[PDB]
Design an enzyme around this catalytic site. Structure first.
Site, PDB file in Angstrom:
ATOM      1  N   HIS A   1      30.762  28.917  58.581  1.00 27.02           N
ATOM      2  CA  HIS A   1      29.429  28.358  58.508  1.00 27.02           C
ATOM      3  C   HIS A   1      29.046  27.688  59.795  1.00 27.02           C
ATOM      4  CE1 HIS A   1      29.309  29.035  54.261  1.00 27.02           C
ATOM      5  NE2 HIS A   1      30.298  28.202  54.028  1.00 27.02           N
TER       6      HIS A   1
ATOM      7  N   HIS B   1      29.837  19.157  64.587  1.00 27.13           N
ATOM      8  CA  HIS B   1      29.674  20.625  64.380  1.00 27.13           C
ATOM      9  C   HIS B   1      28.220  21.008  64.760  1.00 27.13           C
ATOM     10  CE1 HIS B   1      28.285  18.885  60.510  1.00 27.13           C
ATOM     11  NE2 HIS B   1      27.366  19.784  60.750  1.00 27.13           N
TER      12      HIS B   1
ATOM     13  N   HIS C   1      24.656  23.842  64.786  1.00 26.59           N
ATOM     14  CA  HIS C   1      23.751  24.711  64.102  1.00 26.59           C
ATOM     15  C   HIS C   1      22.795  25.394  65.099  1.00 26.59           C
ATOM     16  CE1 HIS C   1      24.518  23.019  60.054  1.00 26.59           C
ATOM     17  NE2 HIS C   1      24.566  21.905  60.740  1.00 26.59           N
TER      18      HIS C   1
ATOM     19  N   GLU D   1      18.327  22.425  62.930  1.00 25.86           N
ATOM     20  CA  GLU D   1      17.996  22.182  61.547  1.00 25.86           C
ATOM     21  C   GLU D   1      16.696  21.381  61.465  1.00 25.86           C
ATOM     22  OE1 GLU D   1      21.895  21.268  59.374  1.00 25.86           O
ATOM     23  OE2 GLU D   1      20.998  23.137  58.614  1.00 25.86           O
TER      24      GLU D   1
ATOM     25  N   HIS E   1      25.652  17.885  65.137  1.00 29.51           N
ATOM     26  CA  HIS E   1      25.768  16.856  64.153  1.00 29.51           C
ATOM     27  C   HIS E   1      27.099  16.181  64.282  1.00 29.51           C
ATOM     28  CE1 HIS E   1      22.754  18.924  61.281  1.00 29.51           C
ATOM     29  NE2 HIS E   1      22.173  18.319  62.306  1.00 29.51           N
TER      30      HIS E   1
ATOM     31  N   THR F   1      23.230  18.661  54.843  1.00 26.10           N
ATOM     32  CA  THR F   1      22.431  19.901  54.953  1.00 26.10           C
ATOM     33  C   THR F   1      23.122  21.170  54.429  1.00 26.10           C
ATOM     34  OG1 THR F   1      23.039  20.509  57.246  1.00 26.10           O
ATOM     35  CG2 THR F   1      21.208  18.916  56.926  1.00 26.10           C
ATOM     36  N   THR F   2      24.298  20.987  53.887  1.00 24.55           N
ATOM     37  CA  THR F   2      25.066  22.081  53.231  1.00 24.55           C
ATOM     38  C   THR F   2      25.499  21.588  51.878  1.00 24.55           C
ATOM     39  OG1 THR F   2      27.091  21.248  54.250  1.00 24.55           O
ATOM     40  CG2 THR F   2      25.985  22.920  55.368  1.00 24.55           C
TER      41      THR F   2
END
Ligand SMILES: [Ca+2]
Ligand SMILES: [Ca+2]
Ligand SMILES: [Ca+2]
Ligand SMILES: [Ca+2]
Ligand SMILES: [Ca+2]
Ligand SMILES: [Ca+2]
Ligand SMILES: [Ca+2]
Ligand SMILES: [Ca+2]
Ligand SMILES: [Ca+2]
Ligand SMILES: [Ca+2]
Ligand SMILES: [Ca+2]
Ligand SMILES: [Ca+2]
Ligand SMILES: [Zn+2]
Ligand SMILES: [Zn+2]
Lengths: 222, 222
Positions: B61, B86, B88, B92, B105, B172-173
């Site tokens: 992910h 991590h 994205h 986001e 993040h 957010t997950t």
């Protein structure tokens, strides 16, 4: 089945029904102890009320005054129509760890059903003439409702100084749904000791939900 | 079973398991489009980081970098220990309706498990030298983890200008748990087009949750 006391009381609300899950898992619940505040450049809230109170209902949890359509507030550029106002004793919100003896909630809904609530603290003081009109006909038993003789303007129960605290919270009674705009007036109104006593007597006890953790939230002050 | 695409994708997360109920009913979800902002008298966030990044994991992910204990931030007077960071792509969060091509993040937790995340936007620009150390050893498949040769200081990936946006939100997950403090840095960092392409190629597509409604919230700006 929920109540303010005992085995169906606030600490157990979330076990009562599936629909009441937010009480159990919510992280943005109301009310709160207003004790983590920041100054913010908030806009004044536009209040466009007309005399519109029509009925007074005792639902066993509060005394609730219905409002006819056409009165609204504007928050974030959106129109929230006033539906009703009701009361709690002692105050639901606390202000730096302390209660007021009474709090009014003015409940508004936008076209999509999103809610905005204006909270007004009342201290013990002079007899409130607007409340007296309501108190005079206050129903004493749950499930009873009475029509008002003359329409009351809820704007008379709001302070003239309109600075406020704002935060994102919840309904304070089940199902305790989140996504609620809370606007809590900084300036307190006044009512008599006798008025407070009458409300408490009819209610039969305290009608406040315990304060819930702020958690991540901050309270913004205008 | 959740993913960023298709039948197990973000619009369906809340139907995948009972534990993911917030993804369905939450009114304080992240990320959001930062488009309702108010100036606020917020305090600087104290960032006390030590060089501590030890491993790099591809979990299918994202690419997640673990941090050893001892590095923390202070929010609301509370210590939140840096656990991991991590990435994205694209961002986001959006800023007035627009994405950045990349977002980092930095995930922190206090002693009771309450979370605080610092988000940092990256634009396309010059090669980022800290990200180059990670990217050089980035595992290409899900479930692979690699130890870093030398410990990286996460502080080098944060801007020197430390003004920020703050709001109360969520992971957010899945399970998209609420009660998360979001601190989104106003100043964007930079990375190369090639760094962004390499991440996206390994991930195999977009790794952002769609922006979620603000609802009752305002975003505060320092
Ligand atoms: Ca001040
Ligand atoms: Ca003031
Ligand atoms: Ca004043
Ligand atoms: Ca005062
Ligand atoms: Ca007063
Ligand atoms: Ca003040
Ligand atoms: Ca400004
Ligand atoms: Ca700047
Ligand atoms: Ca600035
Ligand atoms: Ca900039
Ligand atoms: Ca920059
Ligand atoms: Ca700005
Ligand atoms: Zn109420
Ligand atoms: Zn993330």
């Amino acid at each position: 089945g929920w109540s303010y006391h005992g085995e169906h009381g606030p600490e157990h609300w979330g076990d009562l029904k599936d629909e009441y899950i937010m009480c159990k898992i919510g992280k943005n619940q109301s009310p709160v102890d207003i004790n983590r505040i920041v100054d913010a450049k908030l806009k004044p809230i536009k209040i466009e009320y007309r005399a519109g109170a029509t009925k007074v209902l005792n639902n066993g949890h509060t005394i609730k005054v219905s409002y006819e359509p056409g009165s609204y507030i504007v928050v974030d550029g959106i129109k929230f129509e006033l539906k009703q106002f009701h009361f709690h004793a002692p105050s639901e919100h606390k202000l730096k760890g302390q209660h007021y003896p009474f709090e009014a909630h003015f409940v508004h809904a936008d076209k999509h059903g999103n809610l905005a609530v204006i909270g007004v603290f009342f201290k013990e003081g002079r007899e409130n003439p607007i409340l007296e009109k309501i108190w005079k006909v206050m129903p004493e038993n749950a499930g009873e409702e009475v029509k008002l003789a003359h329409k009351i303007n809820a704007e008379d129960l709001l302070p003239k100084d309109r600075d406020y605290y704002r935060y994102s919270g919840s309904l304070t009674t089940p199902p305790c749904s989140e996504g609620v705009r809370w606007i809590v007036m900084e300036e307190e109104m006044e009512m008599s000791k006798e008025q407070i006593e009458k409300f408490r007597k009819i209610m039969g006890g305290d009608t406040n939900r315990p304060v819930q953790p702020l958690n991540a939230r901050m309270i913004m002050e205008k």
